[PDB]
Amino acid sequence: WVCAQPSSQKATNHNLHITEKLEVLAKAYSVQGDKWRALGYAKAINALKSFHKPVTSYQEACSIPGIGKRMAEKIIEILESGHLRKLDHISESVPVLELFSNIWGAGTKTAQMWYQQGFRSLEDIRSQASLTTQQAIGLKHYSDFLERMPREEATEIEQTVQKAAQAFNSGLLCVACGSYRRGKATCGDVDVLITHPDGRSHRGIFSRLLDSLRQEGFLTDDLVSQEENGQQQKYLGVCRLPGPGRRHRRLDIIVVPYSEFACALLYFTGSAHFNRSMRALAKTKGMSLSEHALSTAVPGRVLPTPTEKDVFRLLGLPYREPAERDW
DNA sequence: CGGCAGTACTG
DNA sequence: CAGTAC
DNA sequence: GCCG
Ligand SMILES: O=c1ccn([C@H]2C[C@H](O)[C@@H](COP(=O)(O)NP(=O)(O)OP(=O)(O)O)O2)c(=O)[nH]1
Ligand SMILES: [Cl-]
Ligand SMILES: [Cl-]
Ligand SMILES: [Mg+2]
Ligand SMILES: [Mg+2]
Ligand code: NA
Ligand code: NA
Ligand code: NA
Ligand code: NA
Ligand code: NA
Numbered sequence: 327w328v329c330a331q332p333s334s335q336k337a338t339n340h341n342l343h344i345t346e347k348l349e350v351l352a353k354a355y356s357v358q359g360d361k362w363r364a365l366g367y368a369k370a371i372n373a374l375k376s377f378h379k380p381v382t383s384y385q386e387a388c389s390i391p392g393i394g395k396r397m398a399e400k401i402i403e404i405l406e407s408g409h410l411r412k413l414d415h416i417s418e419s420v421p422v423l424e425l426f427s428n429i430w431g432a433g434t435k436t437a438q439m440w441y442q443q444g445f446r447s448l449e450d451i452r453s454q455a456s457l458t459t460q461q462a463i464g465l466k467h468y469s470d471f472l473e474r475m476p477r478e479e480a481t482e483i484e485q486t487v488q489k490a491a492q493a494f495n496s497g498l499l500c501v502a503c504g505s506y507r508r509g510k511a512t513c514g515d516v517d518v519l520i521t522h523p524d525g526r527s528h529r530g531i532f533s534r535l536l537d538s539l540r541q542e543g544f545l546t547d548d549l550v551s552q553e554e555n556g557q558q559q560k561y562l563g564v565c566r567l568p569g570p571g572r573r574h575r576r577l578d579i580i581v582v583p584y585s586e587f588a589c590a591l592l593y594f595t596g597s598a599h600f601n602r603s604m605r606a607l608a609k610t611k612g613m614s615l616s617e618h619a620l621s622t623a624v625p626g627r628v629l630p631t632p633t634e635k636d637v638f639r640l641l642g643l644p645y646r647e648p649a650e651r652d653w
Numbered sequence: 654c655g656g657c658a659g660t661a662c663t664g
Numbered sequence: 665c666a667g668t669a670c
Numbered sequence: 671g672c673c674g
Contacts, residue, residue, distance in 0.1 A: 609658080
């Protein structure tokens with residue numbers, strides 16, 4: 327279980343010659359849509375990254391959780407020969423599929439369709455492809471959404487959101503989660519969680535907050551924002567700080583009831599692989615873990631989780647600080 | 654043999 | 665719903 | 671791809 331161990335085990339990778347090659351195959355399977363095969367590669371890569379020493383034998387590889395017969399044979403190949411033959415036999419469509427699936431709002435199905443239709447470049451997409459509203463925004467910001475910002479800029483973005491929120495309710499709590507809370511030096515976006523400790527004033531704040539951030543010109547595009555019926559949980563969009571030298575940055579906001587704060591904070595801090603491991607563990611124990619609650623198997627019972635530590639405790643896991651969840 | 658996390662928008 | 669995303 |  328990745329979630330049972332500190333992610334600092336990957337800081338010293340004794341198998342990088344192997345993992346940098348498996349990573350190429352993992353991405354090739356992912357963009358072609360073979361999600362489960364790609365998942366097995368991703369888990370094997372993490373297992374090899376955390377292992378305490380270089381793997382040197384077939385029996386040694388198979389003994390590692392996440393590494394089976396097939397993955398062992400690839401490891402043996404890279405050790406003996408220095409190369410992996412399959413890397414010379416990846417589908418020729420893969421670079422273009424990767425190019426296309428890096429448009430926000432286009433995944434493997436859209437990328438494969440565009441490839442079948444004869445498109446090979448973003449110029450082809452721009453000039454000939456049918457784009458959803460989201461995809462057109464993704465394409466307009468193609469390079470910007472592939473950039474990571476310095477964490478200092480993420481702080482400024484969080485502060486912009488926080489000041490706008492607290493201006494109409496001074497009791498609102500705002501926390502930047504994701505890679506920022508995990509202590510990374512750069513951030514792909516800013517993930518802001520908003521709640522209110524009184525348990526009720528979080529309701530209806532999206533309309534006021536988004537209007538405020540629009541009034542000051544900070545939000546530039548909206549990707550996901552269901553503003554019609556008042557039940558909105560998330561905003562996914564684009565912002566830009568004022569002044570020269572600024573880039574468009576992705577911004578995600580969630581507003582959660584205080585009763586769900588610990589589970590929402592745990593979810594939104596991640597990492598994604600950490601969450602998936604923790605959720606899979608919870609299931610083996612007759613529980614279910616989401617961004618709303620830790621509950622028993624089904625209508626199940628909601629377990630009491632006032633803090634993140636309580637979730638770890640109820641799953642039998644030692645607590646990990648956010649920086650140690652970077653799987 | 655079949656799951657592989659659990660959930661929220663979009664159209 | 666399938667697709668996509670956090 | 672891996673796992674129970
Ligand atoms: O598939 C996912 C993706 C994200 N998440 C959670 C964990 C993640 O840390 C958080 C924010 O998602 P981001 O896509 O913003 N990733 P993160 O902030 O970890 O890294 P970065 O934004 O720097 O790429 O949402 C999941 O649970 N499942
Ligand atoms: Cl291939
Ligand atoms: Cl907490
Ligand atoms: Mg993020
Ligand atoms: Mg995000
Ligand atoms: Na290691
Ligand atoms: Na194994
Ligand atoms: Na995409
Ligand atoms: Na909308
Ligand atoms: Na599954």
